[PDB]
Design an enzyme around this catalytic site. Structure first.
Site, PDB file in Angstrom:
ATOM      1  CB  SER A 220      -1.024   0.137   0.991  1.00 32.00           C
ATOM      2  OG  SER A 220      -2.089   0.480   1.005  1.00 32.00           O
ATOM      3  CG  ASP A 243      -3.992  -3.721  -3.635  1.00 29.21           C
ATOM      4  OD1 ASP A 243      -3.740  -3.232  -5.651  1.00 29.21           O
ATOM      5  OD2 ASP A 243      -4.622  -4.285  -3.347  1.00 29.21           O
ATOM      6  CG  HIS A 298      -5.718  -2.411   0.566  1.00 23.29           C
ATOM      7  ND1 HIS A 298      -5.048  -2.221   0.288  1.00 23.29           N
ATOM      8  CD2 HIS A 298      -5.370  -0.986   1.767  1.00 23.29           C
ATOM      9  CE1 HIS A 298      -3.939  -1.120   0.606  1.00 23.29           C
ATOM     10  NE2 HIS A 298      -3.906  -0.572   1.123  1.00 23.29           N
TER      11      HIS A 298
END
Ligand SMILES: CCN(CC)CCN(Cc1ccc(-c2ccc(C(F)(F)F)cc2)cc1)C(=O)Cn1c(SCc2ccc(F)cc2)nc(=O)c2c1CCC2
EC number: 3.1.1.47
Length: 371
Positions: A220, A243, A298
């Site tokens: 992330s 991600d 996520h």
């Protein structure tokens, strides 16, 4: 307890390394191949202040600090605490960057599996006020007494969010690069006093690193950190962004990354304006891969995805339709295939080369985001 063991043939040890003791020093959690496998007893979230931090990050007030602490503060993660490093070999090295509102210990499923395959992994704790909490020592005597100074996540106003996130991803890169240096220098005999007192004698790391085989991985915000890091530091020979959240990057990084880069996305986090930054990294003279994990959210990349039950998991957006163990296995294995190709490891990880390509029931080549 529900956090998966490493699937690889090495036993895994865990410890913590701070140096120097200051807020500008390096802080990392180390996962590594242990010589012996005596007990899986590494505490998962080692300090109350993190449960305070999580709570503050998550929106909660004070009581959730305690409820989260009471629910999780004893939970172990399957690694041998301070177990001696397994000798007689040089290990390739990963430096790992946690995401927004995380800290160094919340990606052990990744860390541990990676180590069970011959990796040393340094999960850094970022001091850019992007972690929920972190700590350091105001002076050498504070470190000696365990008199910790705590640093909690900074919340931002709209107007602030472009300058700050980017100033932050620059700091995160300097911190990945610095942890790399810490390790590398230990590897070549730099005497270091850990700011923490722990059974694990840091001298074991001497001559234990394969210095040509370094990778940076993050989730992330950490994925954006992978891309900044490669940009500024060619010691890192390839990167893997789990991600990535591409917002903190200036437009200048895209043309500046020569190392191979791997995008492992979740199906349910991505959005076109994020993805288009990822596409900006593609160039016929460069190696960029991208798979999407089907049914994954996520959080499938962090450890809280194995911390609740199937129901509450889905309620808290911690789990997805795919099984948490099936996901992290795909990501871990896809990673090992990718790390083998671009670090030129001599192992059997190419046996998952297809996972780099999206050749799986649960993998989508490229991205579901049609553009
Ligand atoms: C706006 C800030 N918040 C409030 C909405 C966004 C939070 N968020 C998604 C999210 C969802 C669930 C949980 C969660 C973790 C633990 C628990 C419990 F302890 F209760 F079990 C419950 C819920 C944490 C974050 C994000 O910010 C997603 N995110 C994240 S989440 C990484 C993380 C953080 C904490 C953690 F514990 C695990 C994983 N990292 C990033 O870098 C970025 C993003 C968005 C853009 C950049």
């Amino acid at each position: 307890t529900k956090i998966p063991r490493g699937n690889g043939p090495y036993s895994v040890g865990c410890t913590d390394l701070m140096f120097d003791h200051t807020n500008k020093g390096t802080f990392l959690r180390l996962y590594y191949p242990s010589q012996d496998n005596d007990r899986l007893d590494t505490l998962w979230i080692p300090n109350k202040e993190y449960f305070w931090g999580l709570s503050k990050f998550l929106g909660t007030h004070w009581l959730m600090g305690n409820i989260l602490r009471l629910l999780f503060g004893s939970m172990t993660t399957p690694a041998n605490w301070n177990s001696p490093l397994r000798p007689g070999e040089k290990y390739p090295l990963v430096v790992f960057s946690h995401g927004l509102g995380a800290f160094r210990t919340l990606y052990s499923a990744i860390g541990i599996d990676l180590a069970s395959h011959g990796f040393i992994v340094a999960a850094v704790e970022h001091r850019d006020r992007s972690a929920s909490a972190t700590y350091y020592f105001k002076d050498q005597s504070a470190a000696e007494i365990g008199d910790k100074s705590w640093l909690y996540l900074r919340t931002l106003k709209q107007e602030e969010e472009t300058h700050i996130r980017n100033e932050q991803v620059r700091q995160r890169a300097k911190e990945c690069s610095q942890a790399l240096s810490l390790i590398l220098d230990i590897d070549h005999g730099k005497p270091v006093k850990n700011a923490l007192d722990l059974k694990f004698d840091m001298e074991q790391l001497k001559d234990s690193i394969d210095r040509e085989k370094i990778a940076v991985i993050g989730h992330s915000f950490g994925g954006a950190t992978v891309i900044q890091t490669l940009s500024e530091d060619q010691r890192f020979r390839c990167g893997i962004a789990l991600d990535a959240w591409m917002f903190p990057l200036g437009d200048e990084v895209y043309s500046r990354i020569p190392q191979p880069l791997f995008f492992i996305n979740s199906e349910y986090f991505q959005y076109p304006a994020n993805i288009i930054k990822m596409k900006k990294c593609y160039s016929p003279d460069k190696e960029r891969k991208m798979i999407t994990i089907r049914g994954s959210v996520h959080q499938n990349f962090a450890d809280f995805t194995f911390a609740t039950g199937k129901i509450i998991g889905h309620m808290l957006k911690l789990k997805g339709d795919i099984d948490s163990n099936v996901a992290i296995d795909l990501s871990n294995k896809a990673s090992l295939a990718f790390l083998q190709k671009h670090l030129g490891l001599h192992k059997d990880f190419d046996q998952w080369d297809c996972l780099i390509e999206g050749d799986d029931e649960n993998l989508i080549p490229g991205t579901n985001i049609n553009t």
